[PDB]
Design a protein around this ligand. Structure first.
Ligand SMILES: FC(F)O[C@@H](Cl)C(F)(F)F
Length: 180
C-alpha cells in the first residue's frame, strides 16, 4: 500500500549544529533506504514558524534526498510543536501538493525538547504519528510523557526516546519493517 510520510523536524536554538546535521542525515538515510517503494515524502522544519522544505510533488520530481534538503537553513528560534503538527495536517497533506488520496498518512516528528506553544492537534488525528525525542531534555519520565499527546497510541509503539543523536541509526531496521 501507498504511504505518504512527512518528516517534521525541530530547528530550534536548543539544537547544536552537529545535532541538526544528524537529523538531516537521518531523514536522507530513511529516504534512500525507501527509494523506489510505495513511499513518497515531504519535510517541514519547525521552530517559531513553519517551513515546507519540500512537498510530495518535489519528491516525485527529484527523488534525490541530497538535492531536496540542500537549501535547508537551521532556523535557530523556538519549539512551537503544536502548531507545527497542525501545519502538516492542513498545509502539507494536500492533493494539490502531491498527496495521494489512497495513501496512509504518516508523520515522523523529531525534537530535542518540550513544546513552547500549546493548544491541540485535533486537525492531525487521522495521521499516524511517531515522535522521536532525543537527548538530555528527556532524561526524566515526566519529560518523556509530555511527548505522548503528540503521538498515536500506544505510546510504547509511537514515542521513541533516544539518549543521543547517534542512536537515530538504530531506528532504520524498525522503520523499514513497518506495514501500515
Ligand atoms: F515507523 C516509521 F515511521 O519510523 C518510526 Cl519506527 C520512527 F519512530 F522512526 F519514526
Amino acid at each position: 500500500g501507498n504511504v505518504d510520510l512527512v518528516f517534521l523536524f525541530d530547528g530550534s536554538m536548543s539544537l547544536q549544529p552537529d545535532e541538526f546535521q544528524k537529523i538531516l542525515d537521518f531523514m536522507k538515510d530513511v529516504m534512500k533506504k525507501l527509494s523506489n517503494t510505495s513511499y513518497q515524502f515531504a519535510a517541514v522544519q519547525f521552530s517559531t514558524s513553519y517551513k515546507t522544505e519540500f512537498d510530495f510533488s518535489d519528491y516525485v520530481k527529484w527523488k534525490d534526498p541530497d538535492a531536496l534538503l540542500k537549501h535547508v537553513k537551521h532556523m535557530l528560534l523556538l519549539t512551537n510543536t503544536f502548531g507545527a503538527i497542525n501545519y502538516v495536517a492542513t498545509e502539507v497533506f494536500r492533493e494539490e501538493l502531491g498527496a495521494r488520496p489512497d495513501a496512509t498518512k504518516v508523520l515522523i516528528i523529531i525534537t530535542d525538547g518540550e513544546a513552547t506553544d500549546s493548544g491541540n492537534i485535533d486537525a492531525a488525528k487521522d495521521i499516524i504519528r511517531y515522535i522521536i525525542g532525543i537527548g538530555k531534555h528527556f532524561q526524566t519520565k515526566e519529560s518523556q510523557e509530555t511527548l505522548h499527546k503528540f503521538a498515536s497510541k500506544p505510546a510504547s509503539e509511537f514515542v521513541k526516546i533516544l539518549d543521543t543523536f547517534e542512536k537515530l541509526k538504530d531506528l532504520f531496521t524498525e522503520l523499514q519493517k513497518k506495514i501500515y
